[PDB]
Ligand binder design. Structure first.
Ligand SMILES: CCCCCCCC/C=C\CCCCCCCC(=O)OC[C@H](COP(=O)(O)OCCN)OC(=O)CCCCCCC/C=C\CCCCCCCC
Ligand SMILES: CCCCCCCC/C=C\CCCCCCCC(=O)OC[C@H](COP(=O)(O)OCCN)OC(=O)CCCCCCC/C=C\CCCCCCCC
Ligand SMILES: CCCCCCCC/C=C\CCCCCCCC(=O)OC[C@H](COP(=O)(O)OCCN)OC(=O)CCCCCCC/C=C\CCCCCCCC
Ligand SMILES: CCCCCCCC/C=C\CCCCCCCC(=O)OC[C@H](COP(=O)(O)OCCN)OC(=O)CCCCCCC/C=C\CCCCCCCC
Ligand SMILES: CCCCCCCC/C=C\CCCCCCCC(=O)OC[C@H](COP(=O)(O)OCCN)OC(=O)CCCCCCC/C=C\CCCCCCCC
Ligand SMILES: CCCCCCCC/C=C\CCCCCCCC(=O)OC[C@H](COP(=O)(O)OCCN)OC(=O)CCCCCCC/C=C\CCCCCCCC
Ligand SMILES: CCCCCCCC/C=C\CCCCCCCC(=O)OC[C@H](COP(=O)(O)OCCN)OC(=O)CCCCCCC/C=C\CCCCCCCC
Ligand SMILES: CCCCCCCC/C=C\CCCCCCCC(=O)OC[C@H](COP(=O)(O)OCCN)OC(=O)CCCCCCC/C=C\CCCCCCCC
Ligand SMILES: CCCCCCCC/C=C\CCCCCCCC(=O)OC[C@H](COP(=O)(O)OCCN)OC(=O)CCCCCCC/C=C\CCCCCCCC
Ligand SMILES: [Cl-]
Ligand SMILES: [Cl-]
Ligand SMILES: [Cl-]
Ligand SMILES: [Cl-]
Ligand SMILES: [Cl-]
Lengths: 312, 312, 312, 312, 312
């Protein structure tokens, strides 16, 4: 119907609130995720009032196309949401209530740079379409924003779900619009990653350091190359759960470091053998005895430097 | 049309019943599953009655938009269901019957912590939307809840399909609502997993223990590292059917244990060789003879301790 | 419109016939398959007749919502079909004809227990919704059931496509209903599986039996373990086309058997070496000479016993 | 509206033409492919004419439900197409024009038997639904059949796009119908397959023939088995782009041949070693010297025989 | 309604502008990508004017089916877009404004021939359907073409987004039409590819060149073949992110080159051993000393020649 009359110079205020039911399917490559949630609205129009004399229970008719309903759009969504309108009720002064339910696929950036121990913020963006007579502004109702205890994400824990009360007023296509921001803070559960990825890798790296305790060329070659193939196959196994990231990550830095260490180990085995065939066993013995201590200390220092550069 | 008159102070009772046709596509990563089932309803409204004088067969007209039909929503569903209305019939006292058919994609948590020998419970959640004049409460009709013998799940057996008769009355968005809970208990068929995963793994582990019966360094290195690569490739093969779980599982504990045993075996081979090159064959002989018995007993005890900690 | 008058006490008979165009996408994990087919119907109602005096060509009007059309539902389908109504024609005595076209995704169990040389039966299930005045029963028209020569399934040949003329009358939800069964018998083309899976596997198994012709420990260890890794990678390659089956199959029995034989071969190599180091070459020689003949005979007998237990 | 009057005994002729925009997503397993194309129609009905006195520009009204439009169906399509009607125009003698645009998913068989150097023909099938008064026959308009220079298929070149002008008149479900056939000839670009698949395979095969130049058992075993594993992993890598084909292909014949050659090489190494240990070096030397020349000639002859049997 | 009157001989000009929100899901195999964007339109019709006397705020009614709206189609799209009409406003001289929002899946060719360091241009194509009375031509509004700072593509940076102001006027299906071209220039972020693909490959290649520093046949065979398997598995790992390209690429040329170098290394090891067994150690020593320097220089020169032939 017609919008509220412009006699009340105050912008029509719509108290919004989103109530989460469950968040599922947090895709990392497309950086999307689907949601299922309620959506509340409330606004006051003294042009449709309710006389107390009809009833004391505040008779609140469900009016289709008999009332002016402000319509809400989501910004970062691939498709329009699947709204299911439940009930609309009118107060005796005309403070009309509202209730819906939707499912949507949201687009939000992710940052996989602390990947195993990272934390994300997800955003949902709400605008309201202007009207000719009156004005509409958006406002947050703290008693309606919440989440169910049935909201589970596979792998994540949910910290907070708040809504910045300040709209970001701007002009677009020669039109002024207001925006609302809903933030969802989640942290990744990282205990399973240690015994699943980290410790077997370090076991395989430590196996190839037992070649500094031997003088047999063939055994040392077998050891280092076979462990290198092992590491390649473990990388193949790990990559299946790693989201494809066209940038730099702590895990890939570690993997490059392991690659480098493997190369240097092969170099040292070759140098020991070449020296020993040239009839200089003292120099080879010294070099292998040096390397025994040299390799782990350097590995530890490099790992400390990388954890300082990434998590500091 | 108009809801039943509030003269009968009793809440309008709706006897519900779900009748399963088939459950298919039990996804483990998204923890969803699709269903196909009937849905029955029955309720009594003396405002639309049927005179016995019209017919003795209880003439039961199919009324579209001529009758007040209570509408049912599912809670843990990604999209609204695909309802196909079959037939509505009116009794002579106004006890109206109802019949539909739907397909839906349900969200329900799974717990893959006893993974090979686990058992799940699946939930379907039903609410009824309130009405202004009268009240509606939900009730379960035991003669309509059942499953077809054509309900197959790939890999699972079906134990029971019941419906808790107690609604979970609560208030949401300033509205009181009732809920119904349908539980489906399924158990996983675990015989195929033994000869498919467990026994070849133990064969590969037992092959690398034949190095305690040898004094040849090169052969022992070949044996242990090649079996280790074998184990890595078997893990790569197994992971393709394992749902990705960001938590702790019995199977992954076993795999970590195998990794540890491999590391310790490599350590012992290196220690034997180092001792033997230093001209101390008695000590190496004792250590290998100890290890022969030591490794299987420790493996058995660790496996017993893990099966006690997980299945007890 | 109104159903046929109950004056003719005979149930309204609907001659059905399904005519296949193509069957595509035979999924094995979901055990579904999509179809594309015509659907014919014919029924006689003397309440809408056609006077011969209007025309001698039996004027047959296309009546939308002017005629009582019995509606047909499929039982084992994920979603309702995509019906495209072509033409409806009325005979001079009221024997009305019918013609549609649909595409559907059908759910039907498969049994992958003779997997390489198995044969399946696919089912499509048809019910008719009752009516108040008259009765409807279902009947099969042999002149309309057929398949196009353009029906191809990737990998399968089509034997027969018949329709059991006997309905399975039963009562459901306090309603009696009739059912029709359409069966499609298909057999799997198994020639490509031999040179693709079977013969290379037997080649790899025969390669590791050349260690009974050698006395070199290192060569024998290399041979058996490297072939074992080979077998693991071939299993990885084969599993990509094998549908995931949570039960017992002939192929997996063969694979378990190969695993066992590999274990026993490693045991025998270790026993020969241990005996030879203990200064007992006669016993080792006898054992290897025994094994040369012993291994293939046992393999043949086990394979015969398995083919008898699975295909008999 | 009503069909054209049967006074003109001539069947209503509809000049059809399909104009390609782009062909994308040529799936090989499902043997489908999607298309995007225009669709033209033209037919003459003197029952709706246009007087020259209204305008000399041949006023051509866009008539919805004011004109009899013949409707066109596609036969080998999974779903109905997405028709977007652009414009309908009427000529002064009633030769009405027509224009649409559709996207469709077409089912068409493929034959992957010359796989690397094969050529396909794709078919689109058009029927017209009969009418009661007049008759409709189909006819091809050569000035409307074409393709855009923006039609790209990933990997294929497009040779021709023609339309057999002869309908295949037949009777189906007691109804006579006409069919139109549109053929699209495509050839596969095969240069990238040589350096990507063929040459590295031949390199790996040639590496294992360097064992005929050695007398060291351990080195020869390492060489042949390690190359065999290499070949298995290369097969694993190649299979990812090969469509799954349940039949016989040139490539798989080559692969089986390589498997056989590997087996025979292992046999010859074992025979040389066995002969040499038995104190008969002359016979072993002769056999290895024979094999050096024998293996490549046999490989060449087998490859020639296979290319003659498959491409001749 | 009726189109603008042909009295103004000037073609109706429609100022278009596309405003990007986000570009996601840049598929490389299908060469598609989805978009989400606004779409502006503006055109002047003095047949619907607005009297200044009604209001000074230029009363601008939202007219559904009361105004002649020119309709816009996209050419290279799989399906029609998901238009959501926001608001239409009329100026006092009849310069009507327009505003929509759509999501679409666009087809555009890609050229993966400089793959790691390539740059693409994406196209969106707009036509306008002619009208009988007046003419419509298309024109670009520079104040409406833009992109949000929230437009992210996973892996790419966005350079420019412009619109060629010149239409490509042509005649199709006996109709003249105008076209608009929107170009989006993107460049690929290539830093992560070096430490992820390039350096480990060169490490593995350098490891196998340590065999020119040894005279032990068995060790040299182990080294070269094991590194070759390593390279095969690294290729298997790399191919998972490489789009399937049926043509020639810089990366595949590099990989073929590595394959060739591996073959030549095996040849040289065999030649050294054969010479040394024939009692000619001076010639073998010279050949290995030559190869030490010969291999890297040749590798560098070949890489320079390939980077000149591909990026020049
Ligand atoms: C001991 C020091 C160890 C150094 C390890 C440093 C390290 O981790 O650098 C990684 C870092 C990449 O960071 P990411 O987050 O992975 O960014 C790309 C996305 N994955 O690497 C780079 O910047 C590229 C490579 C730089 C170093 C190249 C070194 C080459 C020299 C070869 C060694 C020769 C040894 C000779 C011995 C005699
Ligand atoms: C540039 C691209 C790199 C190409 C790939 C490199 C192949 C591997 C090279 C291996 C070098 C091994 C050298 C060796 O064993 O010789 C040790 C020899 C000892 O002989 P002496 O009596 O002390 O004096 C020489 C006269 N007899 O010389 C040395 O000690 C050299 C020091 C060893 C460090 C060499 C580091 C090379 C690393 C290259 C990284 C490139 C990136
Ligand atoms: C012999 C004792 C064997 C111990 C095995 C214990 C075991 O299974 O622990 C597993 C358990 C993880 O449980 P999951 O269910 O897998 O949880 C994560 C999700 N997968 O492991 C952990 O808690 C992490 C690792 C703890 C142990 C670390 C041990 C490291 C010490 C190295 C051994 C050195 C040996 C030296 C010999 C001289
Ligand atoms: C910390 C990070 C770990 C780094 C990776 C470790 C590399 C592998 C180390 C292998 C050690 C092998 C030691 C060896 O063979 O020497 C045996 C030598 C015998 O010599 P004796 O005459 O008895 O006295 C010494 C003077 N001759 O010493 C021993 O017996 C040591 C006891 C062996 C147990 C060592 C356990 C080390 C495990 C490290 C786990 C780290 C997590
Ligand atoms: C020589 C005899 C060969 C026996 C092979 C028998 C066989 O194939 O049994 C397979 C059969 C499984 O059938 P499937 O169809 O695969 O069912 C599960 C789904 N895949 O295996 C089983 O039933 C489980 C295992 C039973 C046997 C276990 C044997 C363990 C004993 C180890 C051998 C020790 C040898 C010592 C030598 C000294
Ligand atoms: C239980 C879990 C299994 C753990 C994994 C097993 C590791 C592999 C064991 C290998 C045993 C090799 C024994 C060997 O080589 O010794 C041969 C030795 C010969 O010595 P004699 O002079 O005849 O008398 C002994 C005094 N000198 O003894 C034999 O002949 C034993 C017979 C060999 C068969 C053993 C079969 C063991 C299979 C275990 C399967 C478990 C499932
Ligand atoms: C049937 C299933 C096949 C089972 C798997 C086969 C295992 C591999 C068998 C290897 C056989 C090696 C024979 C060998 O090295 O002996 C050579 C020995 C030489 O001894 P002489 O002094 O000439 O006379 C014998 C008395 N000293 O005999 C020969 O020359 C035999 C000829 C070699 C060809 C054998 C071909 C066997 C191929 C089997 C394929 C089955 C399919
Ligand atoms: C040293 C010179 C190194 C030459 C490397 C040249 C090169 O990279 O050519 C690659 C190029 C392909 O280009 P792509 O972009 O990959 O096109 C197909 C899609 N992937 O290769 C080809 O054209 C095909 C092969 C041509 C060369 C074939 C050489 C065969 C000869 C074998 C060598 C024998 C050595 C004997 C030594 C004694
Ligand atoms: C054609 C298809 C190719 C088939 C696969 C090839 C298998 C590998 C062949 C290996 C050849 C090794 C030759 C060898 O070691 O002999 C060295 C021998 C030395 O003997 P001399 O005393 O100098 O004179 C000979 C009389 N004693 O001869 C040589 O030096 C030959 C020169 C070596 C280069 C050979 C290059 C062959 C490359 C084939 C590529 C095919 C594509
Ligand atoms: Cl929305
Ligand atoms: Cl629902
Ligand atoms: Cl249906
Ligand atoms: Cl169609
Ligand atoms: Cl469009």
């Amino acid at each position: 119907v017609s919008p509220p009359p412009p006699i009340a110079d105050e912008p029509l205020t719509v108290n919004t609130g989103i109530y989460l039911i469950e968040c599922y399917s947090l895709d990392d490559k497309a950086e999307t995720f689907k949601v299922n949630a309620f959506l509340s609205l409330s606004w006051k129009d003294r042009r449709l009032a309710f006389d107390p004399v009809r009833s004391g229970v505040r008779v609140k008719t469900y009016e289709p196309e008999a009332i002016w309903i402000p319509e809400i759009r989501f910004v970062n969504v691939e498709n329009a949401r699947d709204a299911d309108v439940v009930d609309i009720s009118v107060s005796p002064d005309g403070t009309v209530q509202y209730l819906e339910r939707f499912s949507a696929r949201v687009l939000s950036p992710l940052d996989f740079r602390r990947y195993p121990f990272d934390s994300q913020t997800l955003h949902i963006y709400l605008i309201v379409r202007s009207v000719d007579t009156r004005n509409i502004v958006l406002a947050v109702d703290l008693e309606k924003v919440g989440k169910n205890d049935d909201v589970f994400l596979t792998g994540w824990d949910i910290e907070s779900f708040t809504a910045v009360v300040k709209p970001a007023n701007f002009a677009l296509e020669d039109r002024l619009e207001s925006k609302l921001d809903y933030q969802l803070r989640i942290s990744r559960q990282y205990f399973s990653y240690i015994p699943n990825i980290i410790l077997p890798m370090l076991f395989i790296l430590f196996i190839s350091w037992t070649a500094f305790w031997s003088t047999s060329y063939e055994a040392n070659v077998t050891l280092v190359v076979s462990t290198l193939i092992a590491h390649i196959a473990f990388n193949i196994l790990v990559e299946t759960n790693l989201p494809k990231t066209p940038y730099m990550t702590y895990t890939g830095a570690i993997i490059f470091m392991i690659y480098l260490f493997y190369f240097v180990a092969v170099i040292e085995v070759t140098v020991q053998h070449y020296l020993k065939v040239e009839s200089q066993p003292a120099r080879a013995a010294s070099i292998t005895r040096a390397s025994r201590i040299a390799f782990p200390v350097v590995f530890l220092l490099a790992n400390i430097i990388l954890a300082f550069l990434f998590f500091g």
